[PDB]
């Protein structure tokens, strides 16, 4: 299917102010270590004033913080979700299925991803590296997509609709009961991974 509209809107929703991509990659790499991230740690990595870190994050409405005010979630998160995302000996989580496909390339590490089919509850898993997917179980695994909204919180408008399914026919049956969602579409996990690759290429091309 044609994926340009999805790539365009996700980039628009993710890149709200200059420096967002510059901040996002280092942040994901820090979160993948499995501990909360302080704004001063980010400031030092980037060579920015901590105020500026704060300004970028403030536009990032969905950002999750802990009781200490440290960052614990921005796409990749320490707070439990339906999408388990493990890097070596650290268990992390992700906000949605497409996230699990995108982050390995940005972090530079291979992740073991696991979840359950949104329609049937069957366990699903795969291994996602920066360049390819492997051990897709079951082999016909699928993903749902919707068109992201520009002036909405990304979790409410996109992430909550983007799931894994046991198969394409199972996903399509599920989708038949989900009208009024702009751009709702079912793709194989392979097609979704390719969408992630194209998104990443465009995102990285906007960094320093
Ligand atoms: Br198009």
Q: Is 117 an annotated catalytic residue? A: no
Residue 94's DSSP bridge partners are: 76, 83
162-186 in b/e burial notation, b at 16+ Cβ within 10 A? bbbbbbbebbeebbeeeeeeeeebb
| Angle at CA of residue 184, ends 59 and 178, nearest 5° | 110
Structure tokens at 132: 């390819």
User: What does the alpha-carbon distance between residue 54 and residue 32 come to, in Å, rounded to a whole number?
Assistant: 20
Task: Give residue 191 CA to ligand 1 midpoint distance, Å.
Answer: 15
Q: How far apart are the C-alpha atoms of 137 and 124, rounded to whole Å?
A: 6
- How far is the centre of ligand 1, averaged over its atoms, from the C-alpha of 2 (Å)? 5
Do the Cβ atoms of 144 and 154 come closer than 8 Å? no
Cα 30 to its chain centre, rounded Å, is 15
Give me the count of residues in the chain: 208
- CA of 100: how far to CAs of 34, 43, 66, 84, 92, in Å? 16, 26, 22, 8, 11
The ranges assigned to domains in the chain are 1-208
Helices 20-31 and 97-107, axial angle in degrees (round to 10): 90
In whole angstroms, give the CA distance from residue 186 to residue 164. 10
Q: Is 69 left (phi over 0), alpha (psi -120 to 50) or beta?
A: left
Fold of 1-208: Beta-Lactamase (3.30.450)
Nearest alpha carbon to residue 109 among 98, 100, 122: 100
Residue 68 is a catalytic residue? no
- 10 Å CB burial of residue 208 (0-12, 13-18, 19+) is exposed
CA 7 – ligand 1 centroid, Å: 10
Distance between Cα 104 and ligand 1 center (Å):
26
Rounded to an integer, what distance in angstroms lies between the CA atom of residue 39 and that of residue 50?
A: 6
For 170-199, the DSSP string reads HHHHHHTT-TT-TT-EEEEHHHHHHHHHHH
Which two tokens mark 145?
A: 């997509």
Query: What technique solved it?
Result: X-ray
Would you say 104 and 128 are in contact if contact means Cβ atoms under 8 Å apart?
Answer: yes
Candidate list 22, 89, 96, 153, residue with the active-site label: 96
Residue of 22, 89, 159, 173 marked catalytic: 159
Query: Does residue 116 contact residue 122 with C-beta atoms inside 8 Å?
Result: yes
Instruction: Assess contact for 100 and 128: CB atoms under 8 A.
Output: yes
């Amino acid at each position: 299917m044609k994926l340009a509209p999805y790539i365009l809107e996700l980039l628009t929703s993710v890149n709200r102010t200059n420096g967002t991509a510059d901040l996002l990659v280092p942040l994901l790499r820090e979160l993948a270590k499995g501990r909360p991230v302080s704004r001063t740690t980010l400031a030092g990595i980037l060579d920015w004033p901590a105020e500026r870190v704060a300004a970028v994050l403030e536009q990032a409405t969905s950002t999750e913080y802990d009781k200490d005010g440290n960052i614990i979630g921005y796409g990749l998160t320490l707070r439990e979700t339906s999408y388990v995302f493990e890097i070596d000996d650290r268990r992390l989580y992700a906000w949605c299925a497409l996230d699990t496909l995108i982050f390995p390339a940005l972090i530079g590490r291979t992740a073991r991803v696991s979840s359950h089919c949104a329609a049937t509850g069957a366990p699903v898993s795969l291994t996602v590296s920066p360049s390819e997917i492997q051990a897709v179980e079951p082999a016909g695994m699928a993903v749902s997509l919707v068109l992201p909204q520009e002036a909405a919180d990304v979790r409410q408008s996109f992430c909550c609709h983007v799931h894994f399914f046991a198969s394409v026919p199972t996903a399509e049956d599920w989708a038949s009961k989900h009208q009024g969602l702009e751009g709702l579409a079912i793709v194989s996990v392979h097609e979704a991974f390719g969408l992630g690759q194209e998104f990443n290429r465009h995102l990285l091309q906007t960094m320093s």
